Enzyme design. Structure first.
Site, PDB file in Angstrom:
ATOM      1  CE  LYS A 167      30.241 -38.391  -9.599  1.00  0.00           C
ATOM      2  NZ  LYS A 167      29.127 -39.135 -10.336  1.00  0.00           N
ATOM      3  CG  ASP A 168      26.297 -42.734  -5.675  1.00  0.00           C
ATOM      4  OD1 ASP A 168      27.325 -42.396  -6.343  1.00  0.00           O
ATOM      5  OD2 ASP A 168      25.194 -43.375  -5.916  1.00  0.00           O
ATOM      6  CD  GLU A 207       4.930 -27.803   0.918  1.00  0.00           C
ATOM      7  OE1 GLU A 207       5.257 -26.716   0.257  1.00  0.00           O
ATOM      8  OE2 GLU A 207       5.591 -27.998   2.060  1.00  0.00           O
ATOM      9  CB  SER A 217      23.357 -47.046 -15.693  1.00  0.00           C
ATOM     10  OG  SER A 217      23.433 -48.122 -14.513  1.00  0.00           O
ATOM     11  CG  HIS A 240      20.753 -53.694 -10.626  1.00  0.00           C
ATOM     12  ND1 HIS A 240      19.749 -53.349  -9.736  1.00  0.00           N
ATOM     13  CD2 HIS A 240      22.060 -53.163 -10.218  1.00  0.00           C
ATOM     14  CE1 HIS A 240      20.264 -52.544  -8.980  1.00  0.00           C
ATOM     15  NE2 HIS A 240      21.541 -52.288  -9.069  1.00  0.00           N
TER      16      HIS A 240
HETATM   17  C1  HEM Z   1      11.082 -42.965  -5.301  1.00  0.00           C
HETATM   18  C2  HEM Z   1      11.886 -42.326  -6.124  1.00  0.00           C
HETATM   19  C3  HEM Z   1      12.913 -42.845  -6.749  1.00  0.00           C
HETATM   20  C4  HEM Z   1      13.980 -43.763  -6.526  1.00  0.00           C
HETATM   21  C5  HEM Z   1      14.482 -43.992  -4.945  1.00  0.00           C
HETATM   22  C6  HEM Z   1      14.783 -44.290  -7.448  1.00  0.00           C
HETATM   23  C7  HEM Z   1      15.836 -44.905  -7.547  1.00  0.00           C
HETATM   24  C8  HEM Z   1      16.794 -45.045  -8.596  1.00  0.00           C
HETATM   25  C9  HEM Z   1      18.231 -45.347  -8.486  1.00  0.00           C
HETATM   26  C10 HEM Z   1      18.927 -45.631  -7.351  1.00  0.00           C
HETATM   27  C11 HEM Z   1      18.263 -45.114  -9.895  1.00  0.00           C
HETATM   28  C12 HEM Z   1      19.907 -45.673 -10.167  1.00  0.00           C
HETATM   29  C13 HEM Z   1      20.886 -44.330 -10.110  1.00  0.00           C
HETATM   30  C14 HEM Z   1      20.481 -43.368 -11.392  1.00  0.00           C
HETATM   31  O1  HEM Z   1      20.417 -44.060 -12.636  1.00  0.00           O
HETATM   32  O2  HEM Z   1      20.169 -42.289 -11.422  1.00  0.00           O
HETATM   33  C15 HEM Z   1      17.387 -45.114 -10.703  1.00  0.00           C
HETATM   34  C16 HEM Z   1      17.523 -44.780 -11.730  1.00  0.00           C
HETATM   35  C17 HEM Z   1      16.240 -44.742 -12.662  1.00  0.00           C
HETATM   36  N1  HEM Z   1      15.235 -44.189 -12.479  1.00  0.00           N
HETATM   37 FE1  HEM Z   1      14.786 -44.112 -10.700  1.00  0.00          FE
HETATM   38  N2  HEM Z   1      14.230 -43.774  -8.526  1.00  0.00           N
HETATM   39  C18 HEM Z   1      12.916 -43.031  -8.148  1.00  0.00           C
HETATM   40  C19 HEM Z   1      12.025 -42.255  -9.046  1.00  0.00           C
HETATM   41  C20 HEM Z   1      12.160 -42.325 -10.577  1.00  0.00           C
HETATM   42  C21 HEM Z   1      11.147 -41.698 -11.355  1.00  0.00           C
HETATM   43  C22 HEM Z   1       9.878 -40.784 -10.788  1.00  0.00           C
HETATM   44  C23 HEM Z   1      11.431 -42.068 -12.680  1.00  0.00           C
HETATM   45  C24 HEM Z   1      10.754 -41.712 -13.956  1.00  0.00           C
HETATM   46  C25 HEM Z   1       9.485 -41.840 -14.033  1.00  0.00           C
HETATM   47  C26 HEM Z   1      12.609 -43.031 -12.471  1.00  0.00           C
HETATM   48  C27 HEM Z   1      12.994 -43.393 -13.580  1.00  0.00           C
HETATM   49  C28 HEM Z   1      14.631 -43.912 -13.593  1.00  0.00           C
HETATM   50  C29 HEM Z   1      15.434 -44.399 -14.768  1.00  0.00           C
HETATM   51  C30 HEM Z   1      14.859 -44.244 -16.153  1.00  0.00           C
HETATM   52  C31 HEM Z   1      16.420 -44.641 -14.111  1.00  0.00           C
HETATM   53  C32 HEM Z   1      17.832 -44.933 -14.910  1.00  0.00           C
HETATM   54  C33 HEM Z   1      18.771 -43.926 -15.346  1.00  0.00           C
HETATM   55  C34 HEM Z   1      20.120 -44.404 -15.794  1.00  0.00           C
HETATM   56  O3  HEM Z   1      20.586 -45.336 -15.176  1.00  0.00           O
HETATM   57  O4  HEM Z   1      20.346 -43.941 -16.766  1.00  0.00           O
HETATM   58  N3  HEM Z   1      12.882 -43.305 -11.165  1.00  0.00           N
HETATM   59  N4  HEM Z   1      16.422 -44.923  -9.767  1.00  0.00           N
END
Ligand code: HEM
Ligand SMILES: CCCCCCCCCCCCCCCCCC(=O)OC[C@H](COP(=O)([O-])OCC(O)COP(=O)([O-])OC[C@@H](COC(=O)CCCCCCCCCCCCCCCCC)OC(=O)CCCCCCCCCCCCCCCCC)OC(=O)CCCCCCCCCCCCCCCCC
Ligand SMILES: CCCCCCCCCCCCCCCCCC(=O)OC[C@H](COP(=O)([O-])OCC(O)COP(=O)([O-])OC[C@@H](COC(=O)CCCCCCCCCCCCCCCCC)OC(=O)CCCCCCCCCCCCCCCCC)OC(=O)CCCCCCCCCCCCCCCCC
Ligand SMILES: CCCCCCCCCCCCCCCCCC(=O)OC[C@H](COP(=O)([O-])OCC[N+](C)(C)C)OC(=O)CCCCCCCCCCCCCCCCC
Ligand SMILES: CCCCCCCCCCCCCCCCCC(=O)OC[C@H](COP(=O)(O)OCCN)OC(=O)CCCCCCCCCCCCCCCCC
Ligand SMILES: CCCCCCCCCCCCCCCCCC(=O)OC[C@H](COP(=O)(O)OCCN)OC(=O)CCCCCCCCCCCCCCCCC
Ligand SMILES: CCCCCCCCCCCCCCCCCC(=O)OC[C@H](COP(=O)(O)OCCN)OC(=O)CCCCCCCCCCCCCCCCC
Ligand code: HEC
Ligand code: HEM
Lengths: 239, 51, 55, 379, 65, 74, 56, 98
Positions: D227-228, D271, D205, D201
């Site tokens: 949307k979500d 798995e 994004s 935040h």
């Molecule tokens: C436990 C699983 C995960 C949850 C619940 C989670 C949750 C979130 C959420 C809600 C967002 C904002 C929505 C979005 O931008 O798509 C986000 C953004 C992001 N997450 Fe995750 N995430 C998870 C796993 C990961 C993993 C494995 C990575 C990569 C190593 C990661 C890296 C990022 C990045 C780089 C963003 C920014 C994307 C953007 O806003 O352009 N996340 N995450």
């Protein structure tokens, strides 16, 4: 090596929204009662599960009453026999697991409570394996007491041929041909592995209709709220 | 990256080597003490009697 | 055999006949790339687990 | 005197984290997966608890208790298969989320990227310990193989392996500690996801174009909530189709066999969502090298913010990089399939080539290609 | 009692794929039989025939049952 | 990051209409299908080839397993 | 218009909106359950327990 | 000639289809915000409007009509002179640091 995968038979429940033919389930339970239960075992399902599926309550309690079941300690600590009740699991033919191997050549009969859902291939396998017995081809000699079955991995089963035409008499009166017996017992085993099959299909139908209703409406709501942004018209007027 | 190194960074490294080496010794002693690392502890005199 | 760790212990004393037969057995013909003395270090004492490989 | 939504402390946090959060106006459907994972997480917790109330983590009763859940507990089968297929959906969304982050240059967010990597590792650990609980043949033997993997580490080795085992091998104690670790871990995942959102935040994004979207931010609540919600409805559609029409589609049948330690199943595969690692395991002949490659396959995501050399954040305007990324994805599916198959002549060489390509694209092809593109575009 | 499975086998062994699998099967049969000390087994061609026949049999049969 | 100090704009005008005045599906198929076709044309020449070569590799390996599996005449 | 009457009779107030939704769900549950069960029984006619209880 | 390949890559990148220019798509690294801040007022306003229009287009998954595409010969590197100065200043600071 090599193994022969079972062909995809046209099961009655193969359909996406199809249900097990419960009359065939009743006949398959008959088959298990007077054929498979002699040496094969089924534990996780009980007579209670039979009601409302293939037998009525009176028939189920009669079926349970027929067998004899060991009970808890007596008034002095003895192992007294007792007529089985609806809350009794299907009796195990051999008391200890090793005794099953000892009575047989040495391979214990696997429990059928999940054999449909544990064997790769499903009913098509369990069906075909029964209706797949044949004389061994030339050049491959089998041990004494072993039997050749192409579908069984290793091509060497320890089954005496279990299902042959005119083995049992169905209560309904359908012909007791070996294929019919195999099909009905296979359907019963599928029910044993997945008791909730019919309910699962019913709920799946409900889910399909509910989502086909909701998804267009929620998409319409999304379009409604986003239409402020999808129709905006920008303009640039530098001085 | 190559943006580092040069005149000023080498005497920084030289100045901080004694402290970094002492911290490494701290880590080594803490490790051998924490897990009761036998291999080292059959050599220090008074603690040999622990085993 | 005894019964350790949920498995029997098929132990034979491998009388001279058995060990000489094993030495006569070619390593190459065996599917497992193993030699009798290389697996068991005692010609007159073979220590093998129970059960059977391949179910 | 003031709106409660932006004056009450908890309400203020909720407001500036989900309601009035300025988000880019053109985030595609892929961004929706960020929500879905979180929802999946809740769906994993809320369903999982209801399995813990009829599951006994004892070798003598674990499998019998699970069969009791599926056959005697009112609507228990729904909970069990919802849980399993929801874990599969969780991994699907996780992989798609990592793909989105890698594609649209999101790894410049650094802190969020590293927290995501930690979350990913924790989720794989959680699923690994989870598969063991039914105490089937595949559960037991996959646990045996994966724990015996750790014997390759030098020195400590077998001592660490038996420490995890709580004995000489997997047994009742191992099952119990796996159950307890499995119970605790998802709450750590939830806290880490909160930290992930907190870090995200501060900067906003990444929109698909990759340019800063401070000139097109829109309030979150009117648009992205719905949307979500649509995304979550689609995910529920897929998950419910899987549960109610082919519950064991992504599942080995042999797990429906009580774990007998005296029989090795003909096939020993983890798995479906672990095979890409396991295949890499099969590629390296050396055991220590195999374990190092297995961990490096997932650890390589940390190097990504250092390996990006193109002067464009996103990949939307970079064709050759796009082709390289899709080749990487195809290599990932190839690795999954290879891990599924046994280890013979047709598959060994394919696995070696797939592993080499998987590392080469990330570490070599992508940066050099970015240099080529920068040169080709006069910068 | 005439088992419908046997009649399905009989009419379904006529499919020309079954014909080639069968003739290959005797081409294994006499080769293995005449050769005294040979480890070859005709289980391979037998499995080919069984697959070819049983796919067809699965197409039929259940209608009669 | 809250609204108010996001960026600086000048001489930018945004006209917009109420969601209750527009149709939520304005030319859904008349304009949507050409746009989807254009997007597919733009992306397919980059996304398809890796998956088609994956399919070739998968089929080749799957067929390779059997003939190494098949009986060797000897 | 019927839609306009429905709106400014039973949709304007959010509390009336909630009451409408509640009663609509009350009737919709019964209607949908009846319809889906009837369809599912029609597809598998003669293959369910409820279709063979009379025999036994 | 190399210019043909440069034209091909420019057309394949597709940022011209959105009405954008080369310097409108550069990743905003630490030097880039400083370079942007030094831009004159008119260039900054044009840049911000162009980026806003690009985001508007990508939200609807649409592109500019074929006529209004930034042709490769009309593309201007407005940021490049400022970015070069920012990078040179950073290099000088680094050299004095070592
Ligand atoms: C436990 C699983 C995960 C949850 C619940 C989670 C949750 C979130 C959420 C809600 C967002 C904002 C929505 C979005 O931008 O798509 C986000 C953004 C992001 N997450 Fe995750 N995430 C998870 C796993 C990961 C993993 C494995 C990575 C990569 C190593 C990661 C890296 C990022 C990045 C780089 C963003 C920014 C994307 C953007 O806003 O352009 N996340 N995450
Ligand atoms: C007709 C020929 C086939 C066209 C579709 C296949 C294809 O390659 O299209 C590429 C073509 C060009 O890609 P693009 O729109 O430039 O990039 C994708 C968007 O950035 C991001 O996607 P988007 O937001 O523009 O469109 C969302 C799209 C696809 O949504 C997603 O891909 C994300 C969620 C679904 C994942 C995959 C599920 C299967 O939705 C659908 O395709 C229908 C509903 C699917 C479930 C809900 C979403 O895109 C489409 O045709 C639609 C999106 C991809 C569909 C697959
Ligand atoms: C896997 C995990 C589970 C799935 C996760 C899904 C996550 C995303 C959920 C939200 C979502 O779908 O966002 C993408 C996307 C967001 O854009 P949109 O609200 O469709 O508006 C159109 C776009 O501006 C783009 O408009 P356009 O330039 O493509 O032309 C207008 C329109 C017309 O084209 C079509 O509708 C495509 C042809 C089929 C009719 O395009 C679409 O509707 C494209 C989407 C396919 C329908 O929505 C969809 O992909 C629609 C989903 C399918 C329709 C609802 C179910 C029936
Ligand atoms: C994880 C969950 C599953 C996956 C996600 C999908 C969840 C389901 C789909 C989304 C459902 C969202 C809620 C339904 C729509 C909605 O009410 O939007 C709010 C809408 C948005 O604003 P609105 O303008 O549409 O409605 C309010 C204005 N009037 C009253 C004039 C219509 O607001 C309301 O509906 C307010 C009234 C709600 C009354 C609720 C009564 C419930 C009674 C039973 C309890
Ligand atoms: C919450 C918001 C919604 C989340 C998603 C809900 C499920 C998917 C929704 C779309 C499809 C709905 C289909 C449907 O409801 O079909 C009917 C079916 C039950 O049918 P039947 O068993 O015949 O009973 C009918 C009479 N009750 O219904 C079902 O079988 C339901 C679908 C399967 C179960 C999915 C559950 C997902 C959400 C779980 C939330 C749990 C909350 C628990 C809270 C704490 C409780 C202590
Ligand atoms: C992870 C840390 C270890 C956790 C388990 C503890 C036991 C263990 O693995 O090693 C304990 C060991 C004790 O000493 P030890 O090395 O056994 O002395 C005799 C050597 N032949 O001590 C060590 O192994 C200490 C060094 C551990 C780190 C590797 C170097
Ligand atoms: C199969 C892939 C999914 C179906 C849709 C086809 C597709 O992905 O097309 C690529 C799409 C192209 O559109 P765009 O993101 O704007 O990239 C520049 C276009 N000139 O670009 C994207 O869709 C990029 C999405 C990247 C993350 C999701 C895909 C990878 C998942 C890995 C697991
Ligand atoms: C009667 C209706 C049946 C059915 C449906 C089955 N059996 Fe038996 N069985 C017996 C023995 C000694 C074994 C072990 C052989 C081995 O598996 O190596 C079996 C095995 C099975 C299986 C497992 C096959 C597999 O794929 O692993 C199945 C599905 C099976 N059976 C079904 C012995 C007997 C026996 C008397 C000694 C009788 C009678 C039956 N079986 C009857 C049936
Ligand atoms: C991070 C999210 C989670 C994942 C990925 C996950 C994964 C899994 C998997 C793959 C299984 C095996 C299911 C099967 O083989 O049938 C499983 C079982 C189980 N999980 Fe989880 N789980 C998660 C969260 C939880 C939580 C939060 C709990 C506790 C509340 C929990 C408790 C259980 C229990 C008790 C079982 C055994 C029930 C069974 O036999 O299926 N899980 N989990």
């Amino acid at each position: 090596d090599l193994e022969l995968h079972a062909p995809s038979y046209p099961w009655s429940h193969r359909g996406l929204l199809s249900s097990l033919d419960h009359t065939s389930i009743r006949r398959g339970f008959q088959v298990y009662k007077q054929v498979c239960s002699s040496c094969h075992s089924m534990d996780y399902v009980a007579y209670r599960h039979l009601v409302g599926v293939c037998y009525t309550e009176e028939e189920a309690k009669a079926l349970a009453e027929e067998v004899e079941v060991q009970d808890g300690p007596n008034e002095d600590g003895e192992m007294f026999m007792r007529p089985g009740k609806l809350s009794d699991y299907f009796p195990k033919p051999y008391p200890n697991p090793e005794a099953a191997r000892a009575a047989n050549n040495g391979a214990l009969p696997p429990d059928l409570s999940y054999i449909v859902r544990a064997r790769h291939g499903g009913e098509d396998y369990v069906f075909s394996l029964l209706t797949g017995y044949c004389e061994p081809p030339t050049g491959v000699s089998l041990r004494e007491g072993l039997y050749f079955n192409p579908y069984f991995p290793g091509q060497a089963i320890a089954m005496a041929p279990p299902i042959y035409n005119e083995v049992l008499e169905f209560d309904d009166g359908t012909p007791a041909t070996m294929s019919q017996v195999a099909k009905d017992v296979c359907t019963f085993l599928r029910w044993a592995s997945e008791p909730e099959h019919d309910h699962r299909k019913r709920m799946g139908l409900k889910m399909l209709m509910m989502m086909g209703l909701l998804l267009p409406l929620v998409y319409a709501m999304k379009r409604h709220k986003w239409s402020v942004l999808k129709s905006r018209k920008l303009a640039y007027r530098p001085p | 990256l190559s943006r580092f190194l040069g005149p000023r960074y080498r005497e920084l490294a030289r100045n901080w080597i004694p402290t970094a080496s002492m911290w490494g010794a701290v880590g080594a002693v803490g490790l051998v003490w924490a897990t009761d690392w036998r291999l080292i502890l059959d050599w220090v005199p008074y603690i040999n009697g622990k085993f | 055999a005894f019964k350790w760790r949920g498995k029997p212990l098929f132990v034979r004393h491998r009388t001279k006949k058995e060990i000489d037969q094993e030495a006569a057995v070619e390593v190459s013909q065996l599917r497992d790339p193993q030699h009798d003395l290389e697996r068991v270090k005692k010609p007159e004492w073979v220590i093998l687990i129970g059960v059977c490989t391949h179910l | 005197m003031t709106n409660i939504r932006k004056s009450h402390p908890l309400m203020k946090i909720i407001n500036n984290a989900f309601i009035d959060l300025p988000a880019p106006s053109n985030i595609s459907s892929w961004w929706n997966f960020g929500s879905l994972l979180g929802i999946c997480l809740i769906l994993q917790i809320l369903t999982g608890l209801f399995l813990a109330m009829h599951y006994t983590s004892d070798t003598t009763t674990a499998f019998s208790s699970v069969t009791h859940i599926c056959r005697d507990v009112n609507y228990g089968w729904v909970i069990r298969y919802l849980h399993a297929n929801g874990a599969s959906m969780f991994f699907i969304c996780l992989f798609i989320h990592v793909g989105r982050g890698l594609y649209y240059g999101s790894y410049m967010f650094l802190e969020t990227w590293n927290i995501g990597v930690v979350l990913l590792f924790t989720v794989m650990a959680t699923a690994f310990m989870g598969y063991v609980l039914p105490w089937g043949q595949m559960s037991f033997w996959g646990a045996t193989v994966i724990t015996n993997l750790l014997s390759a580490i030098p020195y400590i080795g077998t001592d660490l392996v038996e420490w995890i085992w709580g004995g000489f091998s997997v047994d009742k104690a191992t099952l119990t500690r796996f159950f307890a670790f499995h119970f605790i871990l998802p709450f750590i995942i939830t806290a880490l996801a909160a930290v992930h959102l907190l870090f995200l935040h501060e900067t906003g994004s990444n929109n698909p174009t990759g340019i800063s979207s401070d000139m097109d931010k829109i309030p979150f609540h009117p648009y992205y909530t719905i949307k979500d919600i649509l995304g979550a409805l689609f995910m529920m559609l897929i998950l419910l189709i899987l549960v109610l029409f082919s519950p064991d589609l992504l599942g080995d049948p042999d797990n429906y066999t009580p774990a007998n330690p005296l029989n090795t199943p003909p096939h020993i595969k983890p798995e479906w969502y672990f095979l890409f690692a396991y295949a890499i395991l099969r590629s390296i002949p050396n055991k220590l090298g195999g374990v190092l490659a297995l961990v490096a396959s997932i650890l390589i995501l940390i190097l990504m913010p250092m390996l990006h050399t193109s002067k464009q954040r996103s990949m939307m305007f970079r064709p050759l990089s796009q082709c390289l990324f899709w080749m990487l994805v195809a290599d990932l599916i190839t690795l999954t399939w290879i891990g599924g198959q046994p280890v013979e002549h047709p598959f060994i060489i394919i696995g070696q080539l797939a592993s080499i390509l998987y590392f080469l694209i990330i570490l070599v092809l992508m940066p050099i290609t970015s240099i080529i593109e920068n040169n080709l575009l006069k910068w | 009692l005439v088992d419908p499975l046997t009649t399905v086998r009989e009419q379904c062994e006529q499919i020309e794929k079954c014909i080639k699998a069968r003739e290959r099967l005797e081409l294994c049969d006499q080769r293995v039989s005449s050769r005294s000390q040979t480890e070859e087994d005709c289980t391979e061609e037998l499995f080919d025939f069984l697959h070819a026949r049983d796919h067809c049999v699965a197409h039929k049969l259940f209608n009669s049952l | 990051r809250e609204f108010g100090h996001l960026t600086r704009m000048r001489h930018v005008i945004t006209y917009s209409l109420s969601p209750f005045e527009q149709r939520a599906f304005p030319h859904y198929f008349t304009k949507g299908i050409p746009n989807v076709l254009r997007r597919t044309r733009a992306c397919i020449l980059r996304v398809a080839p890796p998956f088609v070569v994956f399919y070739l590799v998968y089929t080749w390996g799957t067929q390779e397993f059997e003939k190494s599996k098949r009986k060797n005449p000897a | 218009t019927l839609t306009a009457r429905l709106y400014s009779l039973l949709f304007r107030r959010t509390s009336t909106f909630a009451l409408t939704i509640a009663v609509g769900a009350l009737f919709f549950e019964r209607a949908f359950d009846q319809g889906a069960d009837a369809i599912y029984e029609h597809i598998n006619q003669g293959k369910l327990w409820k279709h063979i209880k009379h025999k036994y | 000639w190399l210019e043909g390949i440069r034209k091909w890559y420019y057309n394949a990148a597709g940022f011209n289809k959105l009405g954008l220019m080369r310097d409108d798509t550069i990743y905003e690294d630490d030097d880039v915000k400083e370079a942007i801040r030094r831009l004159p007022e008119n260039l900054y306003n044009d840049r911000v409007f162009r980026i806003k229009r690009a985001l508007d287009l990508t939200m609807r998954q649409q592109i500019l009509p074929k006529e209004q595409w930034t042709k490769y010969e009309e593309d201007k590197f407005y940021l490049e002179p400022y970015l070069k100065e920012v990078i040179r200043e950073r290099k000088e600071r680094e050299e004095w640091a070592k």
